Design a protein that fits this description.
0% strand, mainly alpha, part of a larger assembly, viral envelope protein (chains B, C, E), 6 chains, Capsid protein (chains B, C, E), DNA binding (chains B, C, E), RNA binding (chains B, C, E), globular
Chain lengths: 143, 142, 142, 143, 142, 143
């Protein structure tokens, strides 16, 4: 089927799109911030929000990838190739895990509302030829 | 953090262990059955349930794997290892995705409780000395 | 337009897929069982139910096929191909008519819900790794 | 058993009989008009009327025939014969699908009542030796 | 994003289809008629209706084509190819611009309901073995 | 008849002119965004607003071009000429689509008024000799 991981949460991949690669922080730091401030919840037996759920679920798919790597490590041979893989994992696939981890964690910290609004305004901005883009981009805050 | 896929849904990685690895059916079949009776919802724009959410995501996770699985086969020159990876993805990672798709699709179909009851009800059979283990094992149903 | 035989009756061509082709019994038997417990109604002059209506029509569709099946055998001179057709009719087209007669006669007999539940309840079994698939498969009944 | 596809709908094959071959329009156009103005319904999960039901069911038997043809096409050999079949399909069998598609669609558009009445009066007419038949036949309308 | 220019006006492209393509009048004609009885409005500063709005925009899209059209014959040498373009424009596209301008100008003239009613009406009549149909096809009136 | 696509939206082509043409984002982008936040509506059987309507219809004129385009690159023999047309479309006609797509998507996202004001405002900035045209420029968003 065609599942947009974002509909549920009133967002759509096309929207969450305009956020440029450089925008999301490190998978680590993402993970890091999640455990830093949602661990307890995340660990707990309480689904805490469709948001929380997804987050766990993602924090997890990521791990599996980490292992796919660590095994491609002590298993794939021709370094050159065993490396081709490890980077695909570590990068492309990573970048994706980043959005997810971002979109969620952030909602968890400013609210689907605040987050979505941000996304909309960020777009507007980023969609602007520099010639007219205000100097600095729109940072996400709590208001 | 140590997040258990199954904690919030009343089960636990430990519990699911009751079920023998070679028992969850084919990812395909799982996907197949999901789209067969949840396409709609899954596709809906309203979490229909934590189960729904989970399932959606797991489906999608598997998906990413499949793409990695492809680009690997389309970017690893040396077959030997390309194939080495193209399987691990397609097989081991598969197991996990398999458990997930089952535990959730299964609940969506029969009910967390029923499902959990099943898991327990299954252990038994499976852990029962061959001497006395019924011909038919327990099976989920309505 | 893409009309699904089974949409209005709460199922769907996809769902019925759960059942293996070589599982619907013989057109005969179907017809036989229909006339055995619905001749009356089927023959009545009041739709007794959308199911009834459908069934009536499907019975009749099969019928037309059978006639085509005959006139072919009585009008195609070259056996080879005459026989070529006389089978396709009698066999492939048959499958479909078979599913139909079953899904409807079955509901008429046990109940859309029960029937639908059955289909789902069946998938399971069928999709269950041989290692653990019960001896007896699920079966409809009262 | 002896099922008259028309009893259900207070009609009988003998009645629906007098309608002459030339009377029904093309299977296509029938189909065409159905999709043109009942598609939605027809597609929908709602049985919409014993009428609708039958219609779907027929729109469908027709298709199967189309395929019986298309396969007799890329499968039957001796053209001469592979053609004998394709025409039986396309004609005799077709003419029948036509009535059905007609009788239903029409009720769906003027009502079992109006339709049946028409049929009765049409008969009367058509059953008349030309010597006495009014010039033009009775067309079906909404009143 | 599947968008049917006709949905919001209670009609559909498949419906507008029902009428034979050759039955819609000339872009010119249509155009001239819109100007004939709507210039004012179309030109007006207040959308006078979804119809007006659509119609307006439609007149304008057509325009851009007539332009693309020109610049082509005015920048293209290979006339066969230059003409291929210049025609496809005036044909396969016009036909659409044709029905679109008709569905709207006609609605603004007789009324959505009617227009719609007309469509089925004719469509059907036109497909009726003449032996049995009103003598002369129907037409739009207030 | 001289029809201004913008008149009935209390603005005019001559006004939008304030915005330097090179400033509208990509048709894609624009489309992408429209879908990110209006698909649902756009798609619906309810005219939702002059904006929605105009917009639906423009989202289409585009496609008609993208199609004339495709067909062109598939029926014109002489390539150089093919590629001539294929650009004048994909590029020139495009800008105009770009304008609409923006102007409408933009009002639907921030409001005819706002949108209108933006223009006048942006105008000012831009009209301003470099010597004095400030750092950031006007821009719609959520502060």
């Amino acid at each position: 089927m065609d599942i947009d991981p974002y509909k549920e949460f009133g967002a759509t991949v096309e929207l969450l799109s305009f956020l440029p690669s450089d925008f999301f922080p490190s998978v680590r730091d993402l993970l890091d911030t999640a455990s830093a401030l949602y661990r307890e919840a995340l660990e707990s037996p309480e689904h805490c929000s469709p948001h929380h759920t997804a987050l766990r679920q993602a924090i997890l798919c990521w791990g599996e990838l980490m292992t796919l790597a660590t095994w491609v490590g002590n298993n794939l041979e021709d370094p050159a190739s065993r490396d081709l893989v490890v980077n695909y994992v570590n990068t492309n696939m990573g970048l994706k895990i980043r959005q997810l981890l971002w979109f969620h964690i952030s909602c968890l910290t400013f609210g689907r509302e605040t987050v979505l609004e941000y996304l909309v305004s960020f777009g507007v901005w980023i969609r602007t030829p520099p010639a007219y883009r205000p100097p600095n981009a729109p940072i996400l805050s709590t208001l």
